[PDB]
Write a protein that holds these residues in place. Sequence first.
Motif, PDB file in Angstrom:
ATOM      1  N   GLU A 147      10.349 -47.987 -14.496  1.00 25.41           N
ATOM      2  CA  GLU A 147      10.111 -46.501 -13.550  1.00 25.41           C
ATOM      3  C   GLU A 147      10.352 -45.582 -14.617  1.00 25.41           C
ATOM      4  N   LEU A 148       9.097 -44.773 -15.062  1.00 26.14           N
ATOM      5  CA  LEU A 148       9.300 -44.040 -16.269  1.00 26.14           C
ATOM      6  C   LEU A 148       8.096 -42.719 -15.841  1.00 26.14           C
ATOM      7  N   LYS A 149       8.545 -41.568 -15.812  1.00 27.91           N
ATOM      8  CA  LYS A 149       7.567 -40.554 -16.011  1.00 27.91           C
ATOM      9  C   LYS A 149       7.301 -39.846 -17.156  1.00 27.91           C
ATOM     10  N   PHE A 150       6.200 -39.877 -17.524  1.00 26.95           N
ATOM     11  CA  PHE A 150       5.948 -39.043 -19.027  1.00 26.95           C
ATOM     12  C   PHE A 150       5.655 -37.572 -18.638  1.00 26.95           C
ATOM     13  N   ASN A 151       6.199 -36.651 -19.695  1.00 25.46           N
ATOM     14  CA  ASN A 151       5.989 -35.125 -19.829  1.00 25.46           C
ATOM     15  C   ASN A 151       4.756 -34.844 -20.025  1.00 25.46           C
TER      16      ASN A 151
ATOM     17  N   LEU B 291      -0.259 -38.030 -21.284  1.00 23.90           N
ATOM     18  CA  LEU B 291       0.301 -39.205 -21.260  1.00 23.90           C
ATOM     19  C   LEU B 291       0.339 -39.798 -19.798  1.00 23.90           C
ATOM     20  N   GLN B 292       0.408 -38.823 -18.853  1.00 26.17           N
ATOM     21  CA  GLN B 292       0.474 -39.145 -17.389  1.00 26.17           C
ATOM     22  C   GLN B 292      -1.025 -39.537 -17.176  1.00 26.17           C
ATOM     23  N   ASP B 293      -2.040 -38.703 -17.453  1.00 27.85           N
ATOM     24  CA  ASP B 293      -3.290 -39.045 -17.123  1.00 27.85           C
ATOM     25  C   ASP B 293      -3.726 -39.980 -17.691  1.00 27.85           C
TER      26      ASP B 293
ATOM     27  N   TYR C 156      -2.036 -42.727 -18.702  1.00 27.49           N
ATOM     28  CA  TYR C 156      -1.286 -43.997 -17.835  1.00 27.49           C
ATOM     29  C   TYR C 156      -1.953 -44.315 -16.661  1.00 27.49           C
ATOM     30  N   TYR C 157      -2.334 -43.492 -15.887  1.00 30.11           N
ATOM     31  CA  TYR C 157      -3.118 -43.686 -14.670  1.00 30.11           C
ATOM     32  C   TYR C 157      -4.483 -44.225 -14.966  1.00 30.11           C
ATOM     33  N   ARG C 158      -5.305 -43.959 -15.864  1.00 32.92           N
ATOM     34  CA  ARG C 158      -6.274 -44.722 -16.327  1.00 32.92           C
ATOM     35  C   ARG C 158      -6.173 -45.872 -16.509  1.00 32.92           C
TER      36      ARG C 158
HETATM   37 CL   LIG Z   1       3.680 -40.483 -15.850  1.00 29.85          CL
END
Ligand SMILES: [Cl-]
Length: 314
Positions: A123-127, A131-133, A135-137
Amino acid sequence: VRTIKVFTTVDNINLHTQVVDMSMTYGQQFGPTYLDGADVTKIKPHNSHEGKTFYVLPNDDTLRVEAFEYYHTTDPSFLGRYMSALNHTKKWKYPQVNGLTSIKWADNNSYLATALLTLQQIELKFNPPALQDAYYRARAGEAANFCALILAYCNKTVGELGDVRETMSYLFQHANLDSCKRVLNVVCKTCGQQQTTLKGVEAVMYMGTLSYEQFKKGVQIPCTCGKQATKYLVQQESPFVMMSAPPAQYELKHGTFTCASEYTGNYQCGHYKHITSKETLYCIDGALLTKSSEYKGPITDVFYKENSYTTTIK
Ligand SMILES: [Cl-]
Ligand SMILES: C[C@H](c1cccc2ccccc12)N(C)Cc1c[nH]c2ccccc12
Ligand SMILES: [Cl-]
Ligand SMILES: [Zn+2]
């Protein structure tokens, strides 16, 4: 003087309509220019380029703000290094193995596949939105942008061998781990006791033991006085911990850990596999899956789930 319209971007979020002269290269009009990762700086527009998106270097204040808000770096080489990596990672395969996006072996990428598999289970949230976008791809089965971004953020090139722990350490700097807290107590028979508190990335990584349970009971470490002291975990607040050690034979037990890095070889040259605990133990080795009830092998990282731990040692 014939023209087409194209979009330029540094982030693929903010698109800037350009009228291009078909008699000049992209490089002459825009500076270094990329089309789907390919360097088209020295290539002249083609009629089929009409309405396509080109990446350019941030060469004005508007594009610099856009690149910084997307990538969270001011490093001017970043976009170039991302595009060069992406040119190769868009050609890798991303096997679905046990509901996880893996990478088929290529270009010494075993450390990257292991890191990619690990990131889908902690469980990690990128800033950085980048990286968020990406990661979802990667979760949706298309990990090329995510792998190319990892390589650019770690200043690594496709083809280079790598270390999962160093990769995780760099990525954890771009994650929200600010509220992660670790309290340690060290007991030396000569020096007495020393309590310390760690915050952020240091609070979730440890080098020298694989076993979270042994970290809670006490591990032997060298004291500055030349004797061995006992270090133990007083308090942990984090959604996971990462326990690392030089590779050594180790037994992994179903239900006692999230996932683990297996490494075979030496410090320069070797190969990672990834072990994960579900209803039984799965070993993921790029595209290759093997399952077993028990595991014994050369382990270098183990990931555990956490929320809040307080020792009962008084
Ligand atoms: Cl993320
Ligand atoms: C798991 C491994 C490693 C980690 C720590 C201690 C080790 C001792 C003996 C053998 C391997 C060891 N990494 C990949 C080696 C490595 C570290 N940094 C690198 C950078 C590039 C390539 C390999 C590496
Ligand atoms: Cl490899
Ligand atoms: Zn001491």
